[PDB]
């Protein structure tokens, strides 16, 4: 299997792989290794994939279930990863952004490390979920610390409205720096997988309003732990199921 | 020539044309049309290009003269109108480039911000020592469109203090650099880019791990900007 | 007749020679409205004669009677024009109040900011009305900035834009040069134009008890410089 | 006979029952030192005697002798003033108040994430360049106090835009009115402030009126952060 780096901090393309549910366990393994190391990986020309064949291949990586955000973070046990397939694409626009929340963290100045390591945020959905997540989580498989924030954040705990907004923007500025991100131009047969535990993503609304359809499969993740081993606190449950 | 839209607010790719200083006027005019409407145009497969070839093709467009979002050399009063840029040797990964539409940014402003910007002036400096008060809104000499003039050379706004100047600057830079208003170009060999420096900002991305990278650029002479009441930029230090 | 002393270059005055009450002189009552309009906040010392009925009585000769930086209940379309406030029992330390001059704040704005605010509208809710961020003063014709802590947003702007711009404005409005901080003493009475000021209490007397009696006059609806109304 | 009255709950006191000069008892000049430490800025009314030689004489009793933006005195220096003495000479007919803010109370009240940030944050001070901690430990009281103010040009390891934003977050907490005192200057007024645990700010609301004050600024040791580290010069 070939994995080519697309950027120094994030992104990688993978070929020599016909995505589907009957993959050799060692191919599935090299893909995961790449996914964890590159945060978002891309597959071209998987015109063969359909909804069910895609659902089947995601079953191999884990347990199936605009603006900058990590997926569903208003819930305590939000997704670990997602498999997204292009199905109907607009003649122009419709490209997608991802940022590396692990690298964002590692690159912090130590003062900002100390602050984030001790900062918690309340994540809300504008069904009513409210959750208190650490701003730094320890990645369950890599041990890498990653910044947890994004659009679902409503406030930092213990801080006033003004300071919350301002610090949020400071961190979002560092996460979404172009050097730390990748913009993907979708072509038919394109497939994207990303580690929702070490990324944020953002749809770009620049196909005016043509027709756009992508299919998505989401894998189960677990509750974030901060650097001291404390878990996210649910304020308005409940967890995600299945 | 055939022109393909890359995004709803900025960018187009043009096929059906070989680049040289011997192109048909009817083709040069379709390209200037295309550049003016799309703000940045991309040509692929232009392998034949070469320093003097490229320089000769920029000549049909005007008179020949990075990691921070900016408009080219705005610390000068009559800064460049346009640039033609060619990749020579590219890194193995990374090394893309961003452009944003400062014309579309102005048009989308909320009414109160239109007022503010229409009456605001910035001091652009080269941090030789250039200093130039520009309007924050310039009226484009060919399209008549209003466009935002800011970017990384803006040292401050006229009649505003540092704290408010830095805060308003951000508010403006945020709207200009909205992903819906930008294009990010993955460079390939044979790639040429042309942008209207009078209606855009650009930003190089440093993510090829300081591999080696070479691009050739020809810049074209531009006019002094005029605000929406017909007043022109003022020099404080330096010459055209 | 009476006396008026400037407490600062942009705001506040102290008036001497007057015994506040409902039997007060027409000329007196007139030099006071004059002083209030001109100086935005006015103070009288030594008024130990006042109870609530006489404070009111006097509020009637001026008009019609009824924390964080703010203008009084702006989330209301027709919010109060002016207040009459006296100390009842003060703490032993702290307890001072701030006023800021919104009219001078406008005047001092750079043209770019003038043009912005003359064209800006804000959403004022509680704890819901849209006002001009500049209102023409129904008596002085002075232009004044109408913001303050009741603002939830600016019409047409997004959340990051609203906050950032509100702070820019509030920072100019509450600039020390443009405010007055009053140290209360018994017998003290403050009168201010709610249509040309913001005010803020200071919570710096710990748990001591602090008690004030206030009468509020009726204010009209703000109109912008285009004759537009909330 | 010497009485100290609190002026606000977080900052300020007036000291009555004292005439200033070089002749005060050790115990008196010590009553003054302790009030200064605990209240951060202290005021003396009706001190019509003092002159430019009486002030100096008194200053030496507390130490070793030597504007409308919130700041801490001369922080572009590695070893700035520990305290200053200020007397009114000629005052405008209106305005001319002064503001002080308590940088010890401000630190103490930071939420813990901010404490963490500030205990580890360092600032560059330029009028000359110097590197101070954002939290300094006070030589006498032990108190941790915020070291910021207008002479700060940037934070170490943060970019221009980041520095600015955080600087304002800090300043906003330091200059909160509950944490400040605004002194209305009267002739014969003497103010004394601890420059190691305060910021101060002149208010410029008296138009074109000559405001004449006379200051005696005492000597101060170099700052250390919560790890015993010290300020650097650049």
DSSP chain D: --EEEESSSSS-EEEES---STT--HHHHHHHHHHHHHHSEEEE----S--TTHHHHHHTTTS-----S-B-TTTTSSS--SEEEEEEEE--SS---EEEEEHHHHHHHS-HHHHHHHHT-EEEEE--EEEEESEEE-TTT--EEE--STTEEEETTS-HHHHHHHHHHHHHHHS-GGGEEEE---TT-EEEEETTSEEEEE---S-S---EEEEEEPP-PPPB-TTS-B-EE-
For residue B96, what is the DSSP state?
-
A162 to C167: CB separation less than 8 angstroms, yes or no: yes
Catalytic residue among C45, C68, C128, C214: C214
If we measure between CA atoms, which residue out of A84, A193, A196 comes closest to residue A140? A196
Whole-number Å distance between alpha carbons of A108 and A102: 10
Q: Which secondary-structure segment (H or E) carries C29? A: helix C26-39
Nearest CA in chain A to C163: A162
- Phi and psi angles of residue C209, each rounded to the nearest 5 degrees, phi first: -95, 145
The angle formed by the CA atoms of residues B233, B235 and B240, to the nearest 5 degrees, is 95
DSSP letters for B116-171? HHHT-EEEEE-----EEEEESEEE-TTT--EEE--STTEEEETT--HHHHHHHHHH
Which of A107, A109, A116, A176 to substitute to test the interface with D, most D CBs within 10 Å? A109
Chains touching A (at least 3 CB pairs under 8 A) are B, C, D
CB contact, 8 Å: B69 with chain C?
Answer: no
Whole-number Å distance between alpha carbons of B119 and B113: 10
Whole-number Å distance between alpha carbons of D73 and D206: 23
Residues of A involved in catalysis:
69, 71, 201, 216
Query: Residue C197: beta bridge partners?
Result: C101
Method: X-ray
Whole-number Å distance between alpha carbons of A135 and A119: 5
SS3 B36: helix
SS3 B76: coil
Whole-number Å distance between alpha carbons of B156 and B162: 7
Please compute Rg for chain A using Cα positions. Answer: 18
Whole-number Å distance between alpha carbons of C140 and C151: 25
* Both tokens assigned to C171: 């920072």
Whole-number Å distance between alpha carbons of C226 and A174: 43
Respond yes or no on whether the N-terminal peptide bond of residue A238 is cis (omega within 30° of 0).
yes
Whole-number Å distance between alpha carbons of C169 and C148: 9
* Both tokens assigned to B199: 């209606």
Q: Which secondary-structure segment (H or E) carries B14? A: strand B12-15
Q: Write the CA distances from D24 to D30, D57, D58, integer angstroms.
A: 10, 10, 8
If we measure between CA atoms, which residue out of D30, D20, D28 comes closest to residue D1? D28
What is the residue whose two structure tokens read 């994430």? D113
What is the residue whose two structure tokens read 């770019």? C112
Whole-number Å distance between alpha carbons of B46 and B23: 14
Whole-number Å distance between alpha carbons of D186 and C193: 28
C204 to D10: CB separation less than 8 angstroms, yes or no: yes
If we measure between CA atoms, which residue out of D91, D120, D74 comes closest to residue D191? D91
Q: Write the CA distances from C195 to A236, C39, C102, C142, C218, integer angstroms.
A: 43, 12, 8, 10, 11
Query: In Å, how far from its chain's centre is CA A220?
Result: 12
A-chain residues near D111 (CB < 8 A): 158-159
Contact assessment for residue D113 and residue A156, using Cβ atoms and an 8 Å cutoff: yes
Query: Residue D111 half-sphere exposure, CB side, CA atoms within 13 Å?
Result: 14
Binding residue numbers of A: 69, 71-72, 96, 201, 212, 216
- Alpha-carbon distance A122 to nearest alpha carbon in chain C (angstroms): 18
- Give residues 73 to 92 of B whose Cβ lies within 8 Å of A: 92
* Both tokens assigned to D53: 């030689």
- Phi and psi angles of residue C59, each rounded to the nearest 5 degrees, phi first: -65, -25
Pairing label, strands C143-145, A181-184: unpaired
Pairing label, strands C151-154, D122-126: unpaired
Tell me, letter by letter, the H, E, C secondary structure of chain A. CEEEECCCCCCEEEECCCCCCCCCHHHHHHHHHHHHHHCEEEECCCCCCCHHHHHHHHCCCCCECCCCECCCCCCCCCCCEEEEEEEECCCCCCCEEEEEHHHHHHHCCHHHHHHHHCCEEEEECCCCCEEEEECEEECCCCCCEEECCCCCEEEECCCCHHHHHHHHHHHHHHHCCHHHEEEECCCCCCEEEEECCCEEEEECCCECECCCEEEEEEECCCCCECCCCCECEEEECCCCCC
Question: Catalytic: D214?
Answer: no
Closest by Cβ to C8, choosing from D10, D95, D201: D95
C93 to D184: CB separation less than 8 angstroms, yes or no: no
Could you list the beta-strand ranges (E) of C53-110: 82-89, 97-101
Whole-number Å distance between alpha carbons of A14 and A85: 14
For residue C65, what is the DSSP state?
B
Contact assessment for residue B80 and residue B73, using Cβ atoms and an 8 Å cutoff: yes
Whole-number Å distance between alpha carbons of A225 and A141: 12
Which of C153, C163, C174 to substitute to test the interface with A, most A CBs within 10 Å? C163
Does the annotation place C73 within a ligand binding site? yes
- Residue A53: CB atoms within 10 Å: 15
Whole-number Å distance between alpha carbons of A197 and A39: 9
Residues in chain C: 230
Whole-number Å distance between alpha carbons of A101 and A224: 14
Nearest CA in chain B to D168: B163
Whole-number Å distance between alpha carbons of B32 and A126: 46
* Both tokens assigned to C103: 């009219």
C93 to D205: CB separation less than 8 angstroms, yes or no: no
Burial tier of A241 (Cβ tally within 10 Å: 0-12, 13-18, 19+):
exposed
D-chain residues near C7 (CB < 8 A): 94-95
Contact assessment for residue D37 and residue D195, using Cβ atoms and an 8 Å cutoff: no
Closest by Cβ to C9, choosing from D9, D177, D207: D207
- Residue A9: CB atoms within 10 Å: 22
SS3 B17: coil
Pairing label, strands B137-139, B146-148: antiparallel
- Residue A184: CB atoms within 10 Å: 22
Contact assessment for residue A27 and residue A17, using Cβ atoms and an 8 Å cutoff: yes
If we measure between CA atoms, which residue out of A98, A8, C201 comes closest to residue D176? C201
Chains touching B (at least 3 CB pairs under 8 A) are A, C, D
Which of A3, A8, A162 to substitute to test the interface with B, most B CBs within 10 Å? A8
What is the residue whose two structure tokens read 């609530």? C52
C-chain residues near B118 (CB < 8 A): 115
Sheet containing strand C197-201, strands side by side = C179-182, C97-101, C197-201
D-chain residues near B170 (CB < 8 A): 161
Pairing label, strands D83-90, D135-137: unpaired
- Residue A234: CB atoms within 10 Å: 16
Residues in chain A: 242
In chain B, alpha helices (H): 25-38, 51-58, 102-108, 111-118, 162-176
If we measure between CA atoms, which residue out of A68, A25, A19, A13 comes closest to residue A48? A19
Domains defined for chain D, CATH in brackets: 1-234 (3.60.130.10)
Does the annotation place C135 within a ligand binding site? no
SS3 B38: helix
If we measure between CA atoms, which residue out of B51, B41, B49 comes closest to residue B197? B41
Residues followed by a break in chain D (C to N exceeding 2.5 Å) are: 66, 127
Contact assessment for residue B236 and residue B132, using Cβ atoms and an 8 Å cutoff: yes
Whole-number Å distance between alpha carbons of A71 and A101: 13
If we measure between CA atoms, which residue out of D83, D78, D73 comes closest to residue D123? D78
- Give residues 102 to 161 of D whose Cβ lies within 8 Å of C: none
Whole-number Å distance between alpha carbons of C39 and C6: 8
Question: Catalytic: C72?
Answer: yes
* Both tokens assigned to B147: 């466009």
D178 to C203: CB separation less than 8 angstroms, yes or no: yes
CB contact, 8 Å: A169 with chain D?
Answer: yes
Contact assessment for residue D44 and residue D35, using Cβ atoms and an 8 Å cutoff: no
SS3 C17: coil
Q: Write the CA distances from B232 to A161, B77, B154, B224, D229, integer angstroms.
A: 42, 9, 17, 7, 54
Query: Residue D155: beta bridge partners?
Result: D123
Contact assessment for residue A43 and residue A19, using Cβ atoms and an 8 Å cutoff: yes
C160 to A162: CB separation less than 8 angstroms, yes or no: no
Whole-number Å distance between alpha carbons of B205 and B96: 6
- Residue D111's contacts (CB-CB under 8 Å, 6 or more residues apart) are A158, A159
CB contact, 8 Å: C167 with chain A?
Answer: yes
A-chain residues near C163 (CB < 8 A): 162, 165
Whole-number Å distance between alpha carbons of B106 and B124: 19
* Both tokens assigned to D86: 């200020």
- Phi and psi angles of residue A2, each rounded to the nearest 5 degrees, phi first: -105, 130
Contact assessment for residue D99 and residue D12, using Cβ atoms and an 8 Å cutoff: no
Chains touching C (at least 3 CB pairs under 8 A) are A, B, D
Chains touching D (at least 3 CB pairs under 8 A) are A, B, C
Query: Residue D129 half-sphere exposure, CB side, CA atoms within 13 Å?
Result: 8
Pairing label, strands A233-236, C189-193: unpaired
* Both tokens assigned to C37: 């309009």
CB contact, 8 Å: D69 with chain C?
Answer: no
Whole-number Å distance between alpha carbons of D119 and D225: 7
What is the residue whose two structure tokens read 């018994």? C186
- Residue A24's contacts (CB-CB under 8 Å, 6 or more residues apart) are none
If we measure between CA atoms, which residue out of C161, C210, C165 comes closest to residue C183? C210
């Amino acid at each position: 299997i070939t994995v080519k780096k697309l950027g120094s901090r994030i992104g990688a393309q993978i070929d020599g792989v016909r995505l589907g549910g009957d993959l050799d366990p060692a191919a599935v393994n090299e893909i995961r290794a790449a996914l964890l190391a590159h945060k978002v990986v891309f597959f071209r020309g998987q015109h063969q994939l359909d909804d069910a064949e895609q659902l089947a291949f995601a079953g191999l990586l884990g347990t199936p279930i605009n603006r900058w955000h990590t997926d569903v973070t208003f819930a305590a046990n939000y997704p670990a990863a997602s498999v997204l397939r292009a199905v109907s694409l607009p003649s122009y626009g419709g490209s997608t952004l991802w940022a590396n929340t692990a690298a964002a963290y590692a690159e912090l100045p130590e003062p900002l490390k100390c602050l984030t390591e001790n900062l918690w945020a309340l994540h809300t959905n504008r069904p009513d979920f409210r959750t208190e997540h650490p701003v730094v989580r320890v990645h369950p498989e890599t041990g890498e610390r990653t910044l947890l924030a994004g659009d679902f954040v409503r406030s930092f705990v213990g801080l006033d409205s003004h300071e919350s907004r301002v610090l949020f923007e400071v961190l979002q500025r560092r996460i979404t720096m172009p050097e730390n991100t990748i913009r993907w131009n979708w072509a038919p047969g394109d497939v994207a997988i990303w580690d929702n535990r070490a990324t944020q993503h953002r749809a770009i609304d620049d196909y005016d309003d043509q027709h756009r359809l992508m299919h998505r499969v989401t894998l189960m993740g677990d509750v974030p732990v901060d650097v001291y081993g404390q878990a996210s606190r649910v304020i308005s449950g409940a967890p995600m199921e299945i």
